Structures are given as C-alpha cells and as structure tokens.
Design a binder for this molecule. Structure first.
Ligand SMILES: Nc1ncnc2c1ncn2[C@@H]1O[C@H](COP(=O)(O)OP(=O)(O)O)[C@@H](O)[C@H]1O
Ligand SMILES: [Mg+2]
Length: 326
C-alpha cells in the first residue's frame, strides 16, 4: 500500500487501427489487476511477461468508471485541505486527453448531469460545487491552466498576451518546496457549468500556439490546477496531461519518473529541481498527499514497442510484483 497509485487504461481499436486490420496484443484483467502482452503475431507464441498495477481498466471501460475508482478518493482528500496531483502517461493517441479532458459527443444542450464522455476535468469541477454546496461550506474555486512546451511555461488562460511569453517563476518566501508563477492567470469559477467555457478558451489558445510557434499539444505538458478555499481549509488538485512518451522533453518525463520512483522508495534527494514540471508540482508531491498515475496504451500490434515502454515506465515508478499463476 502507498499514497502513490499506478493504473493502466487500455483503449479500444480506433477505426484507423482497424483500417489497417491490426490485431490486439493487450490482455486486461481488472480482477487480478494484471495486463499482459504477446510477441509473435501469426506465430501465436507463448509470451508471458504480465504486469500488475493498483487497478486495470479494459477496452470497454467507461469514463465515469475511471473517475469513481481514481479521482473520488483524491477529491475528498483535497476538500480536506491537501494538495494532490493526477497524471496521464502514454504514447500520443492512447487516450490521455480523452481521460483527463473528455468530450461531449454531438448531442447538444446538457442538463445538469455529467456527459458520459466527459473526463476528469469536467467531472471534478462539477462534483466540487455539488459536494461543497450540499454541506453548506463557504468556498471559492479558482482554476489555472499553463502549458510546458520545450521546458518553457506558457499560459493558455490569459485572454490578453495573444502570442507566447515564457512565464517567470521563482520559489516564494512563504512556503519552501513551493513556487509562484508570476503573471499566471487564475480564472475564478462561479457556476459549475463554467468549466466547459474555460476549456474552450484554453483550447483555441493551445491551438493558436500550436500553429504560430509549433507548440503542438502532443509535445507539451498540460497542467490544470483547481484551488479550493473553504471554511479554514485550502485544497488544490493538479491534473497533469503529460506529453507523448515517444532531447529536452524526454528528460522532463524521465525526471518525473525519477521523482515518483524516489517518492515510492522513501529515498532522499528527490531531484524536483531537474525540470520545470517537477518543480511546479513539488508542493504537490513532497508534502504527504495522494498521487495517482494513469498510463494509457493502445491494443494494436502496430504500437507494440510503445505499449511495452509505457507499461515499463509504470513498473519503474511503483514496482509491484506479479502474484501466483501470472
Ligand atoms: N476510452 C476511449 N473511448 C473512446 N474513444 C477514445 C478513448 N480513448 C481515446 N479515444 C479516441 O482516441 C483519441 C483521443 O486520443 P488523445 O486523447 O489525443 O491521446 P493523447 O492525449 O495521449 O494524445 C480520439 O480520437 C478519441 O476518439
Ligand atoms: Mg492529447
């Protein structure tokens, strides 16, 4: 048992992976919490090497079923007054954005229930207003969205400053192992339905940067921060949508791995300082908290080598052995 959690969410076959008639190699066992892969294709060889994690979500896994298993325990700790972080790992296209951001699916006006395709970000905000309005707590909710492209920090929330100013950041004398992002826009949310309008602003700004600087989302980290003031508790929840797993980006992810590895093994000299991403979330990983990681993979034999790497990263972060009968 640990405060660090590592789960794996496989994705179905997309039409493109179908269009080339690729065939699955990923086996998801949620009960045993295992996920296995093969090696040969038409050879149908005996390829063991099965992995075990804290939880496993198969191809039929639904969005709500991920929020309940992964986010609900963490949100309660945030409302209690702690800082937390949720991560999404994996090859571009596996489903980090579909898991962290969700969709809407053309169906028009939605009442007050969550969209079935919504992600962690839609659900977390709406559950924040519901749970804190129900227990009559006085609260204020403000969110922030920056983007780490090539290790320079960009705000996707500011309406002004249309191009791209690398935000400056320095350790604030106020709390150590903490930092302050000068100039970072902090949009204050009033209604729970406001979160959908904020994902629109940042989307274009992420697109405007993707076209006028080659700041494609696939090659950048996405940090969503929601802070909750309550009465006197302050809670923060960081939802990080990491860049695709596969000279400077491949270092920030390996740094984050070194951290979580160091966080799981109680080891000293965890090098938060080795990257901008780990330095920002330092106040969310050092101070004892609940950290969760979601590694998204593809079931096609097309992406065999990357699906193995991603699972390999997850094993390195929190190593747990496979138990009897693999
Ligand atoms: N669990 C899922 N259910 C349905 N569609 C999914 C799922 N995961 C991914 N997708 C689909 O795959 C794409 C989402 O990939 P994306 O989130 O961009 O990966 P990444 O964010 O890691 O680059 C979309 O085409 C979406 O339709
Ligand atoms: Mg994406």
């Amino acid at each position: 048992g640990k405060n660090i959690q590592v789960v794996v969410r496989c994705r179905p076959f997309n039409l493109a992976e179908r269009k080339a008639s690729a065939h699955s190699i990923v086996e998801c066992d949620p009960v045993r919490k295992e996920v296995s892969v093969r090696t040969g294709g038409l050879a149908d060889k005996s390829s063991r090497k099965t992995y075990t994690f804290d939880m496993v979500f198969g191809a039929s896994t639904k969005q709500i079923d991920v929020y309940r298993s992964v986010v609900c325990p963490i949100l309660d700790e945030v409302i209690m007054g702690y800082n937390c972080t949720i991560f999404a790992y994996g090859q571009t296209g596996t489903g980090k954005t579909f898991t962290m951001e969700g969709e809407r699916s053309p169906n028009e006006e939605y009442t007050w229930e969550e969209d079935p395709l919504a992600g962690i970000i839609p659900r977390t905000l709406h559950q924040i207003f519901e749970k804190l309005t129900d227990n009559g707590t006085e609260f204020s909710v403000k969110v922030s969205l920056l983007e780490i492209y090539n290790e320079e920090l960009f705000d996707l929330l500011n309406p002004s400053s249309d191009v791209s100013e690398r935000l400056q950041m320095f350790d604030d004398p106020r709390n150590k192992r903490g930092v302050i992002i000068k100039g970072l826009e902090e949009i204050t949310v009033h209604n729970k339905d406001e979160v959908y309008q904020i994902l629109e602003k940042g989307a274009a700004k992420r697109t405007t940067a993707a076209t006028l600087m080659n700041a494609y989302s696939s090659c950048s980290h996405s940090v969503f921060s929601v802070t909750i003031h309550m009465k006197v508790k302050i809670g923060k929840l960081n939802l990080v949508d990491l860049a695709g797993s596969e000279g400077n980006i491949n270092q920030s992810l390996l740094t984050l791995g070194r951290v979580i590895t160091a966080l799981v093994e109680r080891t000293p000299h965890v090098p938060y300082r080795e990257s901008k991403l780990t330095r920002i979330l330092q106040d969310s990983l050092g101070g004892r908290t609940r950290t969760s990681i979601i590694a998204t993979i593809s079931p096609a034999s097309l992406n065999l080598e990357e699906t193995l790497s991603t699972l390999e990263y997850a094993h390195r972060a929190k190593n747990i052995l496979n138990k009897p009968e693999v």
